Symmetry: C6
Subunit: 66 residues, 6 copies
């Protein structure tokens, strides 16, 4: 049903450092702790809850199985 779900899940499972680029030009970095329909929880010191509607791209720091 989804390519998004298995991609994000691979990133979460493998604890791959990612860059999440926002539509406003900000780049966030961390590891994906969890996600659901509308948000991604991006972990560093604290977990930032990122609304998907604000994201342009999710870019892994290295290739991942998917």
């Amino acid at each position: 049903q989804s390519l998004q779900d298995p991609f994000l899940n691979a990133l979460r499972r493998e604890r791959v450092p990612v860059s999440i680029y926002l539509v406003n030009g900000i780049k966030l970095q961390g590891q994906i702790e969890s996600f659901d329909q509308f948000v991604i929880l991006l972990k560093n010191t604290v977990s930032q809850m990122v609304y998907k509607h604000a994201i342009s791209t999710v870019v892994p720091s290295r290739p991942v199985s998917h």
Copy 2:
């Protein structure tokens, strides 16, 4: 069903000071009083009703159980 709901609820329940970053680059601060499907009520002097569609991230000022 949701990771967003228990995260926001933990922030509300624990009265943790948060930063809510808007997609336009404004940073709001306060405590989350309540929220529903589409909005978050952010309390200081008055309660500001923030539309989720305008939010990029919600960042707690300290780690919280979730």
Copy 3:
């Protein structure tokens, strides 16, 4: 079902002056005359129909019961 509806309704009923901040950085002011699922009618000289998708926050000029 909603926190948004009773909040906007309190603002409407009590005729509280509000500021409606748009995502593009414009601040509108007036009283909320009415609202529905998608829009808020903001009254001054004429009524401006404001699409919720364009709004970041609704901020009352004084605390209101909700």
Copy 4:
């Protein structure tokens, strides 16, 4: 069910000159010829089809019954 529909319909029926402000800061002017769920047709020389998602506000040039 809607306040938006009777408002736009009053503007259409009465052929009131309006300003439609876009979220990007452009102001369009004309008369509303027609509208549906997602768009407003704004008439001058030609009819411009305006997506509601791009609109911040619709402001009549004079008060209208609604």
Copy 5:
């Protein structure tokens, strides 16, 4: 059910040159080859697939029957 569909269809059928203005201020030009629920295919050398969510207005270069 729709005013959008017959408008776009008239533009497509009559092969009228159009300007499609994006919310970010870019103006695209061409002829509408096809469209569906979410996108418009705008033809010149190649066909550009334009997401409706990115469009502010569609403006025909001359009046068209609708």
Copy 6:
């Protein structure tokens, strides 16, 4: 049901280099590896997951059958 799906699928199947223009003015380039309802996976060194809501246009580098 869709023109978007067969267009993206032709681009994927034929491995045509594309430009994906974001609403914020960034231009991404690569080949479309896969896509679903909400995202496009754009391949170069790694696969970037691009949210459709952030895309304005998808432009093939050469004409493609559709």
